[PDB]
Design a protein around this ligand. Structure first.
Ligand SMILES: [Cl-]
Ligand SMILES: [Cl-]
Ligand SMILES: [Cl-]
Length: 224
């Protein structure tokens, strides 16, 4: 299927330079199935981060690659489906920081769809993974896709705040710094860094301060 059928209209335009690379990744994914290998998330969720309006994105949260545990990854970085439990450790850690930073109670489930519908892009640098093998699809060609997404956002006039969780994420810092009105939160601890840099990092309140500072509206981070 062509790009415009896979993603939201603004995203289809922003990602038009990687239309060929997206088609090539679809061929890669068919070949993994033909070879007897599995991948996560489900085919229909791979590009799910780009099915919310491009024009509305004000915060970018970037992880490394999807959860490697079958049934966890749903196409939105760090999220899980509402009936998934226990939460993955990364997500439990994020939620601890959510409560500490903002003062809100613990969420009722692990579904970050509300963030996405409010203009947070929940991006992973690499958009698929082989089950139980983290970083197994690193260097297979998703990087050109996600680099294009990040450069297209950085090219807009509009304010953007980036939150880069981990080493793979943090490679995007110089691509982001190239744009005007782009602020990047540093340093770049992963939620699994836990008490060695992640807890107390205040990502959510910092994002909002930086957005207001740049004249944009803040994010409503509230989860039910
Ligand atoms: Cl497999
Ligand atoms: Cl839990
Ligand atoms: Cl995890």
């Amino acid at each position: 299927r062509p790009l415009s059928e896979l993603v939201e209209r603004g995203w289809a335009a922003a990602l038009e330079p990687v239309a060929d690379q997206v088609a090539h990744m679809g061929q890669f994914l068919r070949a993994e199935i033909a070879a007897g290998r599995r991948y996560l998330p489900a085919g229909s969720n791979v590009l799910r981060a780009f099915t919310f309006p491009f024009d509305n994105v004000r915060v970018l949260i970037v992880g490394q690659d999807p959860y490697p545990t079958p049934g966890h990854a749903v196409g939105l970085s760090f999220s899980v489906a509402p009936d998934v439990r226990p939460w993955p450790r990364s997500l439990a850690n994020i939620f601890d920081e959510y409560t500490a930073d903002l003062g809100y109670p613990l969420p009722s489930n692990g579904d970050l769809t509300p963030w996405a519908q409010r203009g947070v892009l929940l991006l992973n640098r690499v958009l698929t993974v082989r089950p139980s093998n983290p970083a197994s699809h690193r260097g297979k060609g998703w990087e050109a896709v996600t680099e294009c997404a990040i450069r297209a956002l950085a090219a807009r006039a509009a304010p953007l705040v980036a939150i880069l969780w981990g080493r793979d994420a943090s490679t995007l810092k110089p691509m982001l710094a190239a744009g005007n009105c782009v602020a990047i939160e540093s340093p770049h601890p992963s939620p699994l860094s836990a008490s060695r840099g992640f807890f107390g990092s205040r990502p959510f309140s910092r994002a909002n301060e930086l957005l207001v500072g740049m004249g944009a509206e803040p994010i409503d981070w509230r989860l039910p």
